[PDB]
Amino acid sequence: ASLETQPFPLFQSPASEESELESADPDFYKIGYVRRVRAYGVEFKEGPDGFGIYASKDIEPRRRARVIMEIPHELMITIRQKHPWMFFPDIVPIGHPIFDIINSTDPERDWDLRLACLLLFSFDREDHFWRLYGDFLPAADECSSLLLATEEDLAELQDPQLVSTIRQQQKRVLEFWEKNWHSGVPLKIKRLAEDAERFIWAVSIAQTRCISMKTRIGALVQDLNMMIPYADMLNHSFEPNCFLHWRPKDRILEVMSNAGQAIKKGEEMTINYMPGQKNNMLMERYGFSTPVNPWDAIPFSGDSRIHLNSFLSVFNIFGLPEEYYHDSESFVDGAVIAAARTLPTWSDIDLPPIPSAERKAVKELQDECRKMLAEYPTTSEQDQKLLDSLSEARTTFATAVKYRMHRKMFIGKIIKALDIYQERLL
Amino acid sequence: KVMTMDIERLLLSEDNRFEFVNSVAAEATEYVEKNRDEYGGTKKAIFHVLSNRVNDLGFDRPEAY
Amino acid sequence: IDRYKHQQLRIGLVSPQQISAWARYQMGYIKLTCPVTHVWYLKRLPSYIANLLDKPLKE
Amino acid sequence: ELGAGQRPLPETMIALVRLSGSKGNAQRGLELLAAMEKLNYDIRQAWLILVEELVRTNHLEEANKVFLKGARGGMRATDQLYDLMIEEDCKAGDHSNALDISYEMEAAGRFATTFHFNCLLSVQATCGIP
Ligand SMILES: C[S@@+](CC[C@H](N)C(=O)[O-])C[C@H]1O[C@@H](n2cnc3c(N)ncnc32)[C@H](O)[C@@H]1O
């Protein structure tokens, strides 16, 4: 099947308007399998939240990490992270205007614009794999990245600093398009993005799908920002069961299931896109948020403080602050780990917590959290209602609602955590 | 028959052929130290190491194929 | 990082003390009645003993 | 509390291990750290504390014993603890342990920097065999 055009992801799943994980169109895997992609024990599934990787079999634990996917380098797109721009699939002919445009980007501010230029050129380069793959990228109406939002959404975002950063991103992108897609460019550039919408879409995809790694291309150890057509279908998790790895002999990106972890049929195969970034950073770049984000922060200014070590032990949290994890030993999750990283806290070599003054601090910080919730016009479950029923699934608007809801739900978990901490301190 | 493709796969996996073969020799001698079953007939410790490692790669090969 | 395997060989002339210390299984020695020059150092040119003493080899 | 009670909360074990490492008593340290296995608690932080307190208590020889037996057990020390322990060993001239710890550090994926090799060389220069 090394030909054909227009394979597509059946839009039966994005029909949630009246009110879940059907298989992706078999051609979506076939176009890879014909090109030496291999998926081992995993299946592409198509929810209304788009694609995901799910284990199609129970996978036994293994001593080394076990391969679950292999993607060959020929199907990837790459830009060098550092100034001397080179392309290792080398799609772009020498002296093509694309190189002049891509050079006119800031070396470190505009890597997304560079990747967007490559993505568009790879839609124009016939019989490049992304000529076929672009149909499976989310269109401009279904991409979650807030670069496609407008003030109608950002008013619902209710986060003026993040609204300002999104506005700056959009301004930067549109200014770059206006500067470099003016009427004087060759047709072999004007046809890449004849309107601003095509470019802002391409940038939003480049942002939401950019992996970055240190890699070895033969002898050259180098830093790449790259797009991998089946590792970018992995969904985020801060407790990932998989990680990406590079083989340089045959230039394969493996997706590896973690060593010593068993996984179950129908489990989502996920990766840790960027470790240690607050939810507002995931909204800034990727365009999503998660309530269990274990690095989120709260603008506390209280002199009330809680005994950190007792907060850990009451929730059986273990490890150093960079390491905090929870074990089998049940509401404790990434949001409680975020709480331990975020609450105004004190610690001492062995000194025990004052059982009274810690309850006083609990009450004070709980009323602080309550006034923080009171700074929003609505509760969490009102946004839950506004998501269990919704007018038109406007993806940017629903993403802003998910953001706000997640934050409130978080602060709620903070309240519940302090309550259960006091009760369980007995 | 097929086992050498697994060898090549593992040779392709490891970043140094000599370091890979050193690690196989180490694994075999620690196997024959941590277990003292004779394990020396129709199946051999080297093939066992290769089998277990390709099973870590996820591939359905039995012990000594 | 390197396992720093260090080993070295030394060749050297042996003292008469070591000759007495000799006493693939065993070694022995002869008590020479007179000193005797090592042919590798007198004869085999350039004469090393002559190079020390600054005497012509004929001497 | 064990004989007529219930499993201790982690700070109990951590505090008693710290009292060991700050007093000496390193055998009691290892005995209790091994007893922590039966609680399924995270041994990493307790072992780090035991090593750090032993180093601070100048109990360097048994600190080296507990550290090497932990590293051979596959635990990774915090980077500050590798750097401090290597430096203090090399100040003590204990290259016999400094080099071994450096191999375990490399095996833990903390690549030895110019600081660590400077520390090793500071002792190697003493041997008279250049
Ligand atoms: C690397 S891209 C994957 C593309 C996505 N599978 C699609 O259907 O286009 C990550 C995207 O998946 C979604 N996503 C990421 N992390 C998620 C999470 N933790 N939960 C739900 N959706 C998530 C967001 O829409 C985000 O833009």
Coordinates of all heavy atoms in Angstrom, one line a residue, chain A residues 32-92:
Chain A
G32 N 2.7 3.2 8.4 CA 3.9 3.0 9.1 C 4.5 1.7 8.9 O 5.7 1.5 8.8
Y33 N 3.7 0.6 9.0 CA 4.2 -0.7 8.9 C 4.8 -1.0 7.6 O 5.8 -1.7 7.5 CB 3.0 -1.7 9.1 CG 3.4 -3.1 9.2 CD1 3.9 -3.7 10.4 CD2 3.4 -4.0 8.1 CE1 4.3 -5.0 10.5 CE2 3.8 -5.3 8.2 CZ 4.2 -5.8 9.4 OH 4.6 -7.1 9.5
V34 N 4.3 -0.4 6.5 CA 4.9 -0.5 5.2 C 6.3 0.3 5.2 O 7.2 0.0 4.4 CB 4.0 0.1 4.1 CG1 4.7 0.3 2.8 CG2 2.8 -0.8 4.0
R35 N 6.5 1.2 6.2 CA 7.7 1.9 6.3 C 8.5 1.6 7.5 O 9.2 2.5 8.1 CB 7.4 3.4 6.2 CG 6.7 3.8 4.9 CD 6.5 5.3 4.8 NE 5.8 5.6 3.6 CZ 6.2 6.4 2.6 NH1 7.4 6.9 2.6 NH2 5.4 6.7 1.6
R36 N 8.5 0.3 8.0 CA 9.3 -0.3 9.0 C 9.0 0.3 10.4 O 9.7 0.0 11.4 CB 10.8 -0.1 8.7 CG 11.8 -0.7 9.6 CD 11.5 -2.1 9.9 NE 12.4 -2.6 11.0 CZ 12.2 -2.6 12.3 NH1 11.2 -1.8 12.7 NH2 13.0 -3.2 13.1
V37 N 7.9 1.0 10.6 CA 7.3 1.2 11.9 C 6.9 -0.1 12.4 O 6.4 -1.0 11.7 CB 6.2 2.2 11.9 CG1 5.6 2.4 13.3 CG2 6.7 3.5 11.4
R38 N 7.1 -0.4 13.7 CA 6.5 -1.5 14.4 C 5.9 -1.1 15.7 O 6.5 -0.4 16.5 CB 7.6 -2.6 14.7 CG 8.2 -3.2 13.4 CD 7.2 -4.0 12.6 NE 7.7 -4.6 11.4 CZ 7.6 -4.0 10.2 NH1 7.0 -2.9 10.0 NH2 8.1 -4.7 9.2
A39 N 4.7 -1.5 16.0 CA 4.0 -1.4 17.3 C 3.9 -2.8 17.9 O 3.4 -3.8 17.3 CB 2.6 -0.8 17.1
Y40 N 4.4 -3.0 19.1 CA 4.4 -4.2 19.8 C 3.5 -4.2 21.0 O 3.7 -3.4 21.9 CB 5.8 -4.6 20.3 CG 6.9 -4.7 19.2 CD1 8.1 -4.1 19.3 CD2 6.6 -5.3 17.9 CE1 9.1 -4.2 18.3 CE2 7.5 -5.3 16.9 CZ 8.8 -4.8 17.1 OH 9.7 -4.8 16.1
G41 N 2.4 -5.0 20.9 CA 1.5 -5.0 22.0 C 0.7 -3.8 22.3 O 0.2 -3.6 23.4
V42 N 0.6 -2.9 21.3 CA -0.2 -1.6 21.5 C -1.1 -1.4 20.3 O -0.8 -1.9 19.2 CB 0.8 -0.4 21.8 CG1 1.8 -0.7 22.9 CG2 1.5 -0.1 20.5
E43 N -2.1 -0.6 20.6 CA -3.1 -0.3 19.6 C -3.4 1.2 19.6 O -3.5 1.8 20.7 CB -4.4 -1.1 19.8 CG -5.5 -0.8 18.8 CD -6.8 -1.4 19.3 OE1 -6.8 -2.5 19.9 OE2 -7.9 -0.9 18.9
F44 N -3.6 1.8 18.4 CA -4.0 3.2 18.3 C -5.5 3.2 18.5 O -6.2 2.5 17.7 CB -3.6 3.8 16.9 CG -2.2 3.5 16.6 CD1 -1.8 2.4 16.0 CD2 -1.2 4.5 16.9 CE1 -0.4 2.2 15.7 CE2 0.1 4.3 16.6 CZ 0.5 3.1 16.0
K45 N -6.0 4.0 19.4 CA -7.4 4.2 19.6 C -7.9 5.6 19.5 O -7.1 6.5 19.9 CB -7.8 3.6 21.0 CG -7.6 2.1 21.1 CD -8.1 1.6 22.5 CE -7.9 0.1 22.5 NZ -8.9 -0.6 21.6
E46 N -9.1 5.8 19.0 CA -9.6 7.1 18.6 C -10.7 7.6 19.5 O -11.9 7.2 19.3 CB -10.0 7.1 17.1 CG -10.6 8.4 16.6 CD -11.3 8.2 15.3 OE1 -12.4 7.7 15.3 OE2 -10.7 8.5 14.2
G47 N -10.4 8.4 20.5 CA -11.5 8.9 21.3 C -11.8 10.3 20.8 O -11.3 10.8 19.9
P48 N -12.9 10.9 21.5 CA -13.2 12.3 21.1 C -12.1 13.3 21.5 O -12.0 14.4 21.0 CB -14.5 12.6 21.9 CG -14.4 11.6 23.1 CD -13.7 10.4 22.6
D49 N -11.2 12.9 22.5 CA -10.0 13.6 22.8 C -8.8 13.2 21.9 O -7.7 13.4 22.2 CB -9.6 13.4 24.2 CG -9.5 11.9 24.6 OD1 -9.8 11.0 23.8 OD2 -9.0 11.6 25.7
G50 N -9.1 12.7 20.7 CA -8.1 12.3 19.7 C -7.5 11.0 19.9 O -8.1 10.1 20.5
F51 N -6.3 10.8 19.3 CA -5.7 9.5 19.4 C -5.0 9.2 20.7 O -4.7 10.1 21.5 CB -4.6 9.4 18.3 CG -5.2 9.4 16.9 CD1 -5.2 10.5 16.1 CD2 -5.7 8.3 16.4 CE1 -5.7 10.5 14.9 CE2 -6.3 8.2 15.1 CZ -6.2 9.4 14.3
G52 N -4.9 7.9 21.0 CA -4.0 7.5 22.1 C -3.5 6.1 21.8 O -4.0 5.4 21.0
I53 N -2.4 5.8 22.5 CA -1.8 4.5 22.5 C -2.3 3.7 23.7 O -2.2 4.2 24.9 CB -0.3 4.5 22.5 CG1 0.2 5.4 21.4 CG2 0.3 3.1 22.4 CD1 -0.2 5.0 20.1
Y54 N -2.9 2.5 23.5 CA -3.4 1.7 24.6 C -2.8 0.3 24.4 O -2.8 -0.3 23.3 CB -4.9 1.6 24.6 CG -5.5 3.0 24.9 CD1 -5.8 3.9 23.8 CD2 -5.9 3.4 26.2 CE1 -6.3 5.1 24.1 CE2 -6.5 4.6 26.4 CZ -6.7 5.5 25.4 OH -7.2 6.7 25.6
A55 N -2.4 -0.3 25.5 CA -1.9 -1.7 25.5 C -3.0 -2.7 25.0 O -4.1 -2.7 25.6 CB -1.4 -2.1 26.8
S56 N -2.8 -3.4 24.0 CA -3.7 -4.4 23.5 C -3.6 -5.8 24.1 O -4.4 -6.7 23.7 CB -3.6 -4.5 21.9 OG -2.4 -5.0 21.6
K57 N -2.6 -5.9 25.0 CA -2.4 -7.2 25.6 C -1.8 -6.9 27.0 O -1.2 -5.8 27.2 CB -1.4 -8.1 24.8 CG -1.3 -9.5 25.3 CD -0.4 -10.3 24.4 CE 1.0 -9.8 24.4 NZ 2.0 -10.7 23.7
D58 N -2.0 -7.8 28.0 CA -1.3 -7.7 29.2 C 0.2 -8.0 28.9 O 0.5 -9.0 28.2 CB -1.8 -8.7 30.2 CG -3.1 -8.3 30.8 OD1 -3.7 -7.2 30.3 OD2 -3.6 -9.0 31.7
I59 N 1.1 -7.1 29.4 CA 2.5 -7.3 29.2 C 3.1 -7.6 30.5 O 3.0 -6.9 31.5 CB 3.1 -6.0 28.6 CG1 2.3 -5.5 27.4 CG2 4.6 -6.2 28.2 CD1 2.3 -6.5 26.2
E60 N 3.8 -8.8 30.6 CA 4.5 -9.2 31.8 C 5.6 -8.3 32.1 O 6.2 -7.6 31.2 CB 5.0 -10.6 31.6 CG 3.9 -11.6 31.4 CD 3.6 -11.9 29.9 OE1 3.9 -11.0 29.1 OE2 3.1 -13.0 29.5
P61 N 6.0 -8.2 33.4 CA 7.2 -7.4 33.7 C 8.5 -8.0 33.2 O 8.6 -9.2 32.9 CB 7.2 -7.4 35.3 CG 6.5 -8.7 35.6 CD 5.5 -8.9 34.5
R62 N 9.5 -7.2 33.0 CA 10.7 -7.6 32.4 C 11.9 -6.9 33.1 O 11.7 -5.9 33.7 CB 10.8 -7.3 30.9 CG 9.9 -8.1 30.0 CD 10.3 -9.6 30.1 NE 9.4 -10.4 29.3 CZ 8.6 -11.3 29.7 NH1 8.2 -11.3 31.0 NH2 7.9 -12.1 28.9
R63 N 13.1 -7.6 33.0 CA 14.2 -7.1 33.8 C 14.8 -5.8 33.3 O 15.0 -4.9 34.0 CB 15.3 -8.3 33.8 CG 14.8 -9.5 34.6 CD 15.9 -10.5 34.6 NE 15.5 -11.8 35.3 CZ 16.2 -12.9 35.3 NH1 17.3 -13.0 34.6 NH2 15.7 -13.9 36.1
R64 N 15.2 -5.8 32.0 CA 15.3 -4.6 31.3 C 14.0 -4.0 30.8 O 13.0 -4.7 30.8 CB 16.2 -4.7 30.0 CG 17.7 -4.9 30.3 CD 18.6 -4.7 29.1 NE 20.0 -4.7 29.4 CZ 20.9 -4.3 28.5 NH1 20.6 -3.9 27.3 NH2 22.2 -4.4 28.9
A65 N 14.0 -2.7 30.5 CA 12.8 -2.1 29.9 C 12.5 -2.9 28.6 O 13.4 -3.3 27.9 CB 13.1 -0.6 29.5
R66 N 11.2 -3.0 28.3 CA 10.7 -3.7 27.2 C 10.3 -2.8 26.1 O 9.5 -1.8 26.3 CB 9.6 -4.7 27.5 CG 8.9 -5.3 26.3 CD 7.8 -6.3 26.7 NE 6.9 -6.6 25.6 CZ 6.3 -7.8 25.5 NH1 6.4 -8.7 26.4 NH2 5.6 -8.0 24.4
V67 N 10.7 -3.0 24.8 CA 10.3 -2.2 23.7 C 8.8 -2.4 23.5 O 8.3 -3.5 23.5 CB 11.1 -2.7 22.4 CG1 10.8 -1.7 21.3 CG2 12.5 -2.8 22.7
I68 N 8.1 -1.3 23.3 CA 6.7 -1.3 22.8 C 6.6 -0.6 21.5 O 5.5 -0.9 20.8 CB 5.8 -0.6 23.9 CG1 6.0 0.9 24.0 CG2 5.9 -1.3 25.2 CD1 4.8 1.6 24.4
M69 N 7.5 0.2 21.0 CA 7.4 0.7 19.7 C 8.7 1.0 19.1 O 9.7 1.3 19.8 CB 6.5 2.0 19.7 CG 5.9 2.3 18.3 SD 4.2 3.1 18.5 CE 4.6 4.3 19.7
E70 N 8.8 0.9 17.7 CA 10.0 1.3 17.0 C 9.6 2.3 15.8 O 8.7 1.9 15.0 CB 10.7 0.1 16.4 CG 11.4 -0.7 17.5 CD 12.2 -1.9 17.0 OE1 11.8 -2.5 16.0 OE2 13.3 -2.1 17.5
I71 N 10.1 3.5 15.8 CA 9.9 4.4 14.7 C 11.2 4.7 14.0 O 12.2 5.1 14.7 CB 9.2 5.7 15.2 CG1 8.0 5.4 16.1 CG2 8.9 6.6 14.1 CD1 8.2 5.4 17.5
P72 N 11.3 4.5 12.7 CA 12.5 4.8 12.0 C 12.7 6.3 11.7 O 11.8 7.0 11.4 CB 12.4 4.0 10.7 CG 10.9 4.0 10.4 CD 10.2 4.0 11.8
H73 N 14.0 6.7 11.8 CA 14.3 8.1 11.7 C 13.9 8.7 10.4 O 13.5 9.9 10.3 CB 15.9 8.3 11.8 CG 16.3 9.7 11.5 ND1 16.2 10.7 12.5 CD2 16.9 10.2 10.5 CE1 16.7 11.8 12.0 NE2 17.1 11.6 10.8
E74 N 13.8 7.9 9.3 CA 13.4 8.5 8.0 C 12.0 9.1 8.0 O 11.8 10.0 7.2 CB 13.5 7.4 6.9 CG 13.1 7.8 5.5 CD 13.2 6.7 4.5 OE1 13.5 5.5 4.9 OE2 13.0 6.9 3.3
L75 N 11.2 8.7 8.9 CA 9.8 9.3 9.0 C 9.7 10.5 9.9 O 8.6 11.1 9.9 CB 8.8 8.2 9.4 CG 8.9 6.9 8.6 CD1 7.9 5.9 9.1 CD2 8.8 7.1 7.1
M76 N 10.8 10.9 10.5 CA 10.8 12.0 11.5 C 11.0 13.3 10.8 O 11.4 13.3 9.6 CB 11.8 11.7 12.6 CG 11.6 10.4 13.3 SD 12.8 10.0 14.6 CE 12.5 8.3 14.9
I77 N 10.8 14.4 11.5 CA 11.3 15.7 11.2 C 12.2 16.2 12.3 O 12.0 16.0 13.4 CB 10.2 16.7 10.9 CG1 9.3 16.2 9.7 CG2 10.7 18.1 10.6 CD1 8.2 17.1 9.4
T78 N 13.3 16.9 11.9 CA 14.3 17.3 12.9 C 14.8 18.7 12.5 O 15.0 19.0 11.4 CB 15.5 16.4 13.0 OG1 16.3 16.4 11.8 CG2 15.1 14.9 13.3
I79 N 15.0 19.5 13.6 CA 15.8 20.8 13.5 C 16.8 20.7 14.6 O 16.6 20.2 15.7 CB 14.9 22.0 13.7 CG1 15.7 23.3 13.6 CG2 14.1 22.0 15.0 CD1 16.3 23.6 12.2
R80 N 18.0 21.2 14.3 CA 19.0 21.3 15.3 C 18.6 22.4 16.4 O 18.0 23.4 16.0 CB 20.4 21.8 14.7 CG 21.5 21.7 15.7 CD 22.8 22.1 15.2 NE 23.8 22.1 16.3 CZ 25.1 21.8 16.1 NH1 25.6 21.6 14.9 NH2 25.9 21.8 17.1
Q81 N 18.8 22.0 17.6 CA 18.4 22.9 18.7 C 19.2 24.2 18.7 O 18.7 25.3 19.0 CB 18.4 22.2 20.0 CG 17.9 23.0 21.2 CD 17.9 22.2 22.5 OE1 18.7 22.3 23.4 NE2 16.8 21.3 22.6
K82 N 20.5 24.1 18.4 CA 21.5 25.2 18.4 C 21.7 25.7 17.0 O 21.4 25.1 16.0 CB 22.8 24.7 19.1 CG 22.6 24.0 20.4 CD 22.1 25.0 21.4 CE 21.7 24.3 22.7 NZ 22.8 23.5 23.3
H83 N 22.3 26.9 17.0 CA 22.2 27.8 15.9 C 22.5 27.2 14.5 O 21.7 27.5 13.6 CB 23.2 29.0 16.1 CG 23.2 30.0 15.0 ND1 22.1 30.9 14.8 CD2 24.1 30.3 14.0 CE1 22.4 31.6 13.7 NE2 23.6 31.3 13.2
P84 N 23.6 26.4 14.3 CA 23.9 26.0 12.9 C 22.9 25.0 12.4 O 23.0 23.8 12.5 CB 25.3 25.3 13.1 CG 25.3 24.9 14.5 CD 24.6 25.9 15.3
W85 N 21.9 25.6 11.7 CA 20.7 24.8 11.3 C 21.0 23.8 10.3 O 21.6 24.0 9.2 CB 19.6 25.8 10.7 CG 19.3 26.9 11.6 CD1 19.2 28.2 11.2 CD2 19.0 26.9 13.0 NE1 18.8 29.0 12.2 CE2 18.7 28.3 13.3 CE3 18.9 25.9 13.9 CZ2 18.3 28.6 14.6 CZ3 18.6 26.3 15.2 CH2 18.3 27.6 15.6
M86 N 20.6 22.5 10.6 CA 20.8 21.4 9.7 C 19.6 20.5 9.8 O 18.9 20.5 10.9 CB 22.1 20.6 10.0 CG 23.4 21.3 9.9 SD 24.8 20.2 10.2 CE 24.8 19.2 8.7
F87 N 19.3 19.7 8.8 CA 18.2 18.9 8.7 C 18.7 17.5 8.4 O 19.3 17.2 7.4 CB 17.2 19.3 7.7 CG 16.8 20.8 7.9 CD1 17.2 21.7 7.0 CD2 16.0 21.1 9.0 CE1 16.8 23.1 7.1 CE2 15.6 22.4 9.1 CZ 16.0 23.4 8.2
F88 N 18.4 16.5 9.3 CA 19.0 15.2 9.2 C 18.2 14.2 8.3 O 18.8 13.3 7.7 CB 19.3 14.7 10.6 CG 20.4 15.4 11.2 CD1 20.2 16.5 12.0 CD2 21.7 15.1 10.9 CE1 21.2 17.3 12.5 CE2 22.8 15.9 11.4 CZ 22.5 16.9 12.3
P89 N 16.9 14.3 8.2 CA 16.2 13.8 7.0 C 16.6 14.7 5.8 O 16.4 14.2 4.6 CB 14.8 13.8 7.3 CG 14.7 13.8 8.8 CD 15.9 14.6 9.2
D90 N 17.1 15.9 6.0 CA 17.6 16.8 4.9 C 16.6 16.9 3.8 O 16.9 16.9 2.6 CB 18.9 16.2 4.4 CG 19.9 17.4 4.1 OD1 19.4 18.4 3.6 OD2 21.1 17.2 4.3
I91 N 15.3 17.2 4.2 CA 14.3 17.3 3.2 C 14.6 18.5 2.3 O 14.4 18.5 1.1 CB 12.9 17.5 3.8 CG1 12.6 16.3 4.9 CG2 11.8 17.4 2.8 CD1 13.0 16.7 6.3
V92 N 15.0 19.6 2.9 CA 15.0 20.9 2.2 C 16.2 21.0 1.3 O 17.4 20.8 1.7 CB 15.1 22.1 3.3 CG1 15.1 23.4 2.6 CG2 14.0 21.9 4.3

